[PDB]
Amino acid sequence: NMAIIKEFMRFKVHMEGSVNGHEFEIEGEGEGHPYEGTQTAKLKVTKGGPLPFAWDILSPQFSKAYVKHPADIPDYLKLSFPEGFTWERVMNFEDGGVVTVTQDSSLQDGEFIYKVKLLGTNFPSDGPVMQKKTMGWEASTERMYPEDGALKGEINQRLKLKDDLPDDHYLSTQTILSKDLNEKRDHMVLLEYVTAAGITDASGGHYDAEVKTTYKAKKPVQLPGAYNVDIKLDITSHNEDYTIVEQYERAEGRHST
Amino acid sequence: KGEELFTGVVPILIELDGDVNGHKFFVRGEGEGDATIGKLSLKFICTTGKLPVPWPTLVTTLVQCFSRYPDHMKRHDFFKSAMPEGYVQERTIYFKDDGTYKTRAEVKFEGDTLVNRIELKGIDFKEDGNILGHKLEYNFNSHKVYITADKQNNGIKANFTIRHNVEDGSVQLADHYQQNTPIGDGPVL
């Protein structure tokens, strides 16, 4: 009927959080097309600015009512309204850093209301998060599936690191020198083979996080089967110290197999 | 990026103006590199008549952008990254118990061909030494070029030792100290 969620919706978001002992608050405004899978937001740091850490760990915490769902796939979070839903999330980064979130999504006066509480913990001081070496998120796929009477999701999320240098490696060389027997000038004929080596593991460009989210509707609505959601988050702009940031996201659901 | 340029066979032009202990010479060469297999096929010609130095000594001097970088190491390729703009390759070669080469080269794209233009100056070479005396065998051996990226130059550093077989059975070593640097001003990655 689309009487509750319109084709275009605005939301308001508040985040209070503490990362490595640094408190802060963020208030922001956003808008988008819930059925098209597209949304934007402009965030402002209202307290504890500027932030000593990378913005990229906060960006995924700013909206799953905006995911585009096929008709045969029940939209669990859309159906949760007007009452709304909450979600809680655990991000485990490869270097031991952890981000935890609890959020509340409600609907008032034709606008979504987001309330966020966050903690980052055990981030190494020379790590890319505290060193602001992150370049933003790679496109993600969240595996969704019903469990414990709720909707859960699972992401292997790649964060791009600031490009440093070639690092350390070597080149293996082979060369044969010959002569052209019909060549009347002093000359050298050469054939050479060079291949690079010294690095196996292949990833110094990326910072990985194991993410597990739980989405609970405040009222008992219909749960979908197991499926996937493709997600891409972009930072469209920002100021120098990242106290003002604009974001964009596209998310669309599809069948798993 | 630049990897697109090297996805296939690339024609090569090389020009060298040398000076060694006053002996002046010019060497030109032509051929094609393949970066996918890391192969080089080239023929070089001295236009000044007799070459005052042995050919093997000019080999390292005479286009590492054609080195094959395995898929996982592709982001670590400095040479292809500077293209088409190109890079400046400087070396100082210490020949054991002998003189030293000093080279400055610009490796870039002129049209569809990869161009390497070198300027070489040798000094302090023994008149009866292995180089000026032409005692080196005609052949080359396998080596390892150790590459480390250096700091403020927005580019890479390198060093390695070349083993030149001497016809008397001994070995003439050449210590290479290399540094590179882009041409265009901006991000390389």
Numbering used by the authors:
A (entry chain C): 4 to 65, 69 to 263
B (entry chain A): 3 to 64, 68 to 194
Question: What does the primary publication say about this deposited structure?
Answer:
A modular strategy for protein crystallization using split green fluorescent protein (GFP) as a crystallization partner is demonstrated. In the present study, the protein chosen as a target for crystallization was superfolder Cherry (sfCherry), a version of red fluorescent protein engineered in our laboratory. sfCherry was chosen as a test protein so that the folding of the target could be monitored by red fluorescence while the GFP reconstitution could be monitored by green fluorescence. Our new folding-enhanced sfCherry contains six mutations: R36H, K92T, R125L, S147T, K162N and N196D. Also, previous studies on GFP have shown that it can form the basis for a complementation system: fragments composed of either β-strand 11 or a hairpin comprised of β-strands 10 and 11 can reassemble with truncated forms of GFP lacking these segments.
The crystal structure of the sfCherry-GFP(10–11) hairpin in complex with GFP(1–9) was determined at a resolution of 2.6 Å. Analysis of the complex shows that the reconstituted GFP is attached to the target protein (sfCherry) in a structurally ordered way. We concluded that insertion of the GFP hairpin at the permissive site Asp169/Gly170 of sfCherry was the better choice for folding of the target and subsequent binding to GFP(1–9). The crystal asymmetric unit contains two copies of the complex. With two complexes in the asymmetric unit, and two linking chain segments between the two protein components in each case, there are four linking polypeptide segments. All of these segments are well ordered and clearly visible in the final electron-density map. When the GFP components of the two independent complexes are spatially overlapped, the sfCherry components differ in the two cases by a rotation of only 9°. The relative orientation of the two components differs by 9° when the two complexes are compared. This appears essentially as a minor hinge motion through the two points of connection; twisting and rotation about the other orthogonal direction is evidently limited by the double connection. The GFP dimer interface is mediated through β-strand 10 (inserted in sfCherry) via the sequence Gln180, Ile182 and Leu183 and the loop Phe145, Asn146 and Ser147 connecting strand 6 and strand 7 of GFP(1–9). The crystal structure exhibits strong packing interactions in all three dimensions owing to the dimerization of the reconstituted GFP, the linkage between GFP and sfCherry (creating linkages in the xy plane) and the dimerization of sfCherry (creating linkages in the z direction).
